Amino acid sequence: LNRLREPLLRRLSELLDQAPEGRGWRRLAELAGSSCLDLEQCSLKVLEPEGSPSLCLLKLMGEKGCTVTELSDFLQAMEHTEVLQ
């Protein structure tokens, strides 16, 4: 999450931004179990020409202290295996 380098996070964010899926980034922010300011500041971070909501959400979950295998478990729960590959 917050520990890793620039290209992995950048590519994962710029791939998660282009989400034609109905289970998009707002779905990925809404996980199972574990207020408004997170969603509002990500949705205002998208207004810049070079931003993603995905970057804001990955920074948020890195501030959560999530780990890469933990997030991969959440992504398997997200049940789009195209993201995991």
């Binding site: 282009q18 989400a19 034609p20 707002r26 969603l39 509002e40 949705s43 205002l44 998208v46 207004l47 020409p49 909501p53």
Partner: protein
């Protein structure tokens, strides 16, 4: 960049019908009048209208001359925190039209 400008323009003007109902017309043009994008002549032209809705119409259509106006339209709504649920709606609209532009790039 002007690509953001054009997608911002059509991303506003595609959705004129919904926004011209749930917006009080008078309660904003002191904030955006401080941004030096709107004048007293606009205030008199808006007050020339008699209907509720057409005020919102000509006011909403009187912002398509500068790209940065929509932010100010957010900002007063950000300022007076009475209603705020329109934000992620128009935001998701911008993400959608941005996605079509992005797929049209390659």
């Amino acid at each position: 960049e002007e690509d953001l400008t054009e997608v911002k323009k059509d991303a506003l003007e595609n959705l004129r019908v919904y926004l011209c109902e749930k917006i009080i017309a008078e309660r904003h043009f002191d904030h955006l009048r401080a941004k030096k994008i709107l004048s007293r002549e606009d205030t008199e032209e808006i007050s020339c209208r008699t209907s509720s809705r057409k005020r919102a119409g000509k006011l909403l259509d009187y912002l398509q001359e500068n790209p940065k106006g929509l932010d100010t339209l957010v900002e007063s709504i950000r300022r007076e925190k009475t209603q705020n649920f329109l934000i992620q709606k128009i935001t998701d609209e911008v993400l959608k039209l941005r996605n079509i532009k992005l797929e049209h790039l390659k």
